[PDB]
Design a protein around this ligand. Structure first.
Ligand code: HEM
Length: 328
């Protein structure tokens, strides 16, 4: 059925990934994946936490989190998990470091597909809107018997239909200044019913200011030359993946900017950066500064920070690097 369209669409669009085909087909990626069940996909029990916890057993994998404009690929292990809440963590600085908003995790599937590049095995998680949250791919280092055993436990014969779904500047400013830690920002936005960009515009320019759209490239190239550790956050509504480390290679390619490290890859569509902001948020160890990028539709494409550990102030080198960017 819809599977038949997918096959045709795929035939007709070889350089497009599932996410792109789904859009072409007028449907969510989750709905597309649901249609592939019995063909090259199987439905898994929709228990994010159980699946996540179980992944600790498989060892090395390739984790992918993305939004429309950026893709973050990290090699690592689902260890050091802390999921007893809506805000979950997989805490591995410099390796697989995830921040999870578990209330957004709706469905899960497993695929074994033939691609233009070979056979890939994965587990894919989708949100309530049917968008991809997170993907886990098998690698040469994955513990296969453990992966196979996890699937045996989580695969379900049933494939139920998916239940998809759809004031003052001065005060905002004072609330932002009153924060004691960055993590309080989400509640800040929630209580004033604001988007990140809307809050940025409301507050003082010392707290949030615009820089040129070329700022990302400038920053990545500066970090690559200086070899200071930085952090790159790429996320979506239910998941944020964080790279921490030195930038080994940055390479632009047409509309893209890429970071190629041994165990991390960033693919970002530079040309979609519509607004670039520098923001500063308070913490017990002082202010922390980040570069935040947004697409025309308001999507946060990515965000950068300098490496930091609790009880240490913001990196000086980072602060100096940000200082070299051009306003406007
Ligand atoms: C408790 C262990 C955690 C550690 C050690 C940690 C570490 C960090 C660090 C170093 C930063 C950069 C800002 C700074 O230097 O302070 C940051 C920001 C951030 N964290 Fe955490 N984090 C933790 C928990 C969480 C959790 C549970 C979530 C969500 C589930 C989360 C989501 C984020 C987000 C989205 C940012 C960017 C903040 C912004 O500027 O909007 N973190 N974290």
């Amino acid at each position: 059925s819809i599977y038949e369209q997918y096959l045709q669409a795929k035939a007709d669009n070889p350089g497009k990934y599932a996410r792109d085909l789904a859009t072409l087909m007028g449907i969510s990626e989750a709905e597309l994946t649901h249609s592939r069940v019995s063909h090259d996909a199987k439905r898994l029990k929709g228990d994010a936490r159980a699946l996540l916890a179980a992944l600790e057993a498989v060892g090395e994998v390739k984790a992918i989190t993305r939004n429309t404009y950026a893709v973050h690929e990290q090699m690592g292990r689902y260890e050091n998990q802390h999921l007893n809440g809506h805000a979950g963590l997989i805490l591995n600085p410099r390796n697989l470091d995830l921040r999870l908003f578990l209330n957004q995790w709706a469905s899960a599937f497993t695929l074994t597909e033939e691609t233009r590049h070979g056979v890939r095995h994965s587990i894919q998680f989708f949100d309530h809107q049917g968008d991809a949250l997170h993907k886990v791919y098998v690698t040469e280092q994955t513990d296969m018997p453990a992966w196979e055993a996890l699937l045996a436990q989580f695969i379900t014969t049933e494939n139920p239909e998916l239940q998809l779904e759809p004031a003052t500047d001065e005060a905002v400013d004072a609330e932002w200044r009153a924060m004691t830690d960055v993590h309080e920002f989400f509640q800040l936005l929630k209580r004033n019913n604001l988007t990140r960009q809307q809050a940025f515009r409301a507050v003082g320019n010392d707290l949030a200011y615009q820089v040129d759209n070329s700022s990302l490239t400038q920053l990545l190239n500066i970090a690559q030359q200086e070899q200071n550790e930085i952090m790159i956050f790429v996320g979506n509504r239910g998941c944020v993946q964080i790279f921490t480390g030195m930038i080994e290679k940055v390479t632009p390619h047409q509309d893209w900017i890429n970071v190629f490290n041994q165990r991390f890859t960033l693919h970002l569509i530079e040309t979609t950066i519509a607004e670039s902001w520098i923001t500063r948020k308070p913490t017990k160890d002082g202010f922390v500064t980040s570069l935040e990028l947004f697409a025309a539709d308001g999507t946060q494409i990515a965000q950068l920070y300098g490496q930091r550990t609790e009880g240490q102030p913001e990196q000086t080198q980072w602060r100096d690097q940000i200082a070299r960017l051009n306003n406007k």
